[PDB]
Structure 1
Amino acid sequence: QANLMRLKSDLFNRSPMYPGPTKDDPLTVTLGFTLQDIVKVDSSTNEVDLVYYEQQRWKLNSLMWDPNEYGNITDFRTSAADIWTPDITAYSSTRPVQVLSPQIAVVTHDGSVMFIPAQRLSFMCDPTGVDSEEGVTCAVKFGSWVYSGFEIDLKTDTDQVDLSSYYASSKYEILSATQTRQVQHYSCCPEPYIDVNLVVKFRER
């Protein structure tokens, strides 16, 4: 109980919070999706509702410690509010995201952070042909709202969305789900603009 209290005091009660990255101190955020359910389709509004877990991981020098100094604690859990978190946003939502899980992150002694929020998202999607054998394709991009790729670089560990927990009695079955990093450049500017494209192909069961 005691070494952890000390570690957290040491990490959190001593300096201002991390102010976020800059181009002189860039950060890499690694994203992945575990798709649980396509819950709803609305063909009068072209909105589709997804339930997934969004895996998010980054690393901060200000969150590192030496485990031998803290009773060999190698990792711990804490409220997401105790730490800086990236501003990763769906770019084509139609409602505010609903959070389904506790807002708790895992911090490792090398400064790595893993935060996995469960979300319900309503996003822009034309479900025409969902009842077909070929099904429909919809796509939503995720990225930072304010940081270019010189401040937050966005990575993934795979382009295959994790379907291992997809609801087997969902009204819709998944034909495919990919998560692909896209890099855009504007003529004005040397810095890249990076997003992760969540592309899902599905039909009525």
Structure 2
Amino acid sequence: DKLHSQANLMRLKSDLFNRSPMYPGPTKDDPLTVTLGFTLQDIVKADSSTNEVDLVYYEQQRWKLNSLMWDPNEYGNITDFRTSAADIWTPDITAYSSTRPVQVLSPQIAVVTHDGSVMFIPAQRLSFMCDPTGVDSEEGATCAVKFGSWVYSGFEIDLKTDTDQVDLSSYYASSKYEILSATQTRQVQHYSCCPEPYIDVNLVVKFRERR
């Protein structure tokens, strides 16, 4: 019973990976939209001697490829599967003002659904450039970090968020810092030199010491 559904996975993965492409990333002819959302878990540390703040968050990434589509009927009605994030193409989304390599906190496993969409939610600790003056005041501190593609312009990779409100429903209730607000905003930058636009998601967090 269970054997057969396992052999259909094996054929599906073989068709998709071994007998096919492999996907060389997006182009201007075939652009890709990548949806980003943040779930801020903690501001672990705000260092006023080096102006670095450390955040822990889950970063949800979603995109869709024609090359990852299948008909569930040809594969015993399997509609999705888990795969190592290293066994598929993934987007090169990066913080633009990190000061330390990102530390990955969760397994590197993505889920592929039959419509060709991919879900990947890496949990991470990020140090990034930020001046925390005002954390010990009523109004608090403000920090900002952009995320986007390192090498693709808005012509190959478009970014989007589902909402501009950072998910705060798992924010650690006993953090050294209380969150005043956290937004995530798609921003487009144009240059008079260059025909191609650049997209980033801007993460802005205002916070203060838990009084």
Please state which band the TM-score falls in when normalised by the shorter chain.
over 0.9
Asked if residue 10 in structure 1 is aligned to residue 15 in structure 2, the reply is yes
Report the alpha carbon displacement of residue 22 of structure 1 after superposing the two structures with TM.
0.6
TM (norm. structure 1) is 0.98
Structure 1 residue 188 displacement after superposition: 1.5
The CA deviation string for residues 119-152 of structure 1, in whole angstroms up to 9 with x for no partner, is 1000001011101111111000000000000000
Task: Give matches, 1:151-162, under 5 Å.
Answer: 151-162=156-167
Cα displacement string for residues 148-190 of structure 1 (whole angstroms, at most 9, x for unaligned residues): 0000001110000000000001110100000001110001122
Deviations 1:3-26 (A, max 9, x none): 111111111111242100010110
Match of 2:191 in 1: 186
Which whole-Å CA distance do the structure 2 matches of 1:71 and 1:201 have between them? 50
- Find out whether 1:29 has 2:34 as its counterpart: yes
Secondary structure in structure 1 of the residue aligned to 2:8: helix
Q: Secondary structure at the match of 1:94?
A: coil
Q: Within 1, Cα distance between the matches of 2:78 and 2:157?
A: 29
Taking only aligned residues, the RMSD between alpha carbons, in angstroms, comes to 0.7
In structure 2, C-alpha distance between the alignment counterparts of 1:68 and 1:78, rounded to whole Å: 20
- 2-side partners of 1:172 and 1:5: how far apart? 48
Return the alpha-carbon distance in structure 2 between the equivalents of residues 203 and 96 of structure 1.
25
State the alpha-carbon separation in 2 of the partners of residues 49 and 179 from structure 1. Answer: 17
Q: Distance in 1 between matches of 2:71 and 2:97?
A: 42
Question: Using the alignment, how far apart are the partners of 2:193 and 2:110 within structure 1?
Answer: 38
Structure 2 Cα separation of the partners of residues 97 and 83 of structure 1: 20
Compute the displacement of 1:37 (Å): 0.4
User: Who is 1:108 aligned against?
Assistant: 113
Deviation sequence 1:92-127 (CA, Å, 0-9, x none)? 000000000000001000100011000100000101
In structure 1, the gaps of 5 or more residues are none
Q: 1:19, 1:145 → 2: CA distance?
A: 16
Q: How many residues align?
A: 205
Q: What residue number does 1:176 align with?
A: 181
Aligned-partner Cα distance in 2 for 1:9–1:165:
38
Give SS of 1:146's match. Answer: coil
Structure 1 residue 42: Cα displacement: 0.7
Q: Residue 68 of structure 1 corresponds to which residue in structure 2?
A: 73
Shift of 1:192: 1.0
Q: Give 4+ residue runs of structure 1 displaced > 2 Å after superposition.
A: none
1:11 is paired with a residue of what secondary structure?
helix
Q: Could you say which residue in structure 2 is the equivalent of 1:41?
A: 46
Unaligned runs of 5+ in 2: 1-5
Distance 1:50 1:177 in 2: 12
